[PDB]
Structure 1
Amino acid sequence: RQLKAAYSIELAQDLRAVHGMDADAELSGILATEIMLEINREVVDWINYSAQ
């Protein structure tokens, strides 16, 4: 499983300013968390899939 993300440099500046959060870490904090949720869903999904 894999995922990608595309953030512009100027967005990193604006997000670092104004609000005050690093634009880079959020996408890493989103993609990695999202993938783990899907796998954690797939394990649950298979159980109901295979249940009698």
Structure 2
Amino acid sequence: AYSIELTQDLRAVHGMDADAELSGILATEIMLEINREVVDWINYSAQVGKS
């Protein structure tokens, strides 16, 4: 939920998209969390070693 007034001026000053910069950090953030999840299950589901 970015803004319509943003992409007007941001793209004017910085030339950035301001959409694919958000779409790029959401699509990445779900792929990181899904990946942090299993490695947080393995260490959650792992027996206590050296026991």
Asked if Structure 1 and Structure 2 have the same fold, meaning a TM-score greater than 0.5 normalized by the shorter chain, the answer is yes
TM bin, normalised by shorter chain, reads: 0.7 to 0.9
Cα distance per residue 1:8-33 (max 9 Å; x no partner)? 11101111111110011111001000
Q: Please give the alpha-carbon distance, in whole angstroms, between the structure 2 residues aligned to 1:38 and 1:45.
A: 10
TM-score by length of 2: 0.86
Stretches of 4+ aligned residues off by more than 4 angstroms: none
Give the share of equivalent positions with the same residue, in percent: 98
RMSD over aligned Cα atoms: 0.6
**What is the aligned residue count?**
47
Q: Which has the higher helix share?
A: 1
User: Radius of gyration: which is bigger?
Assistant: 2
The answer for unaligned runs of 5 or more in structure 2 is none
TM-score by length of 1: 0.84
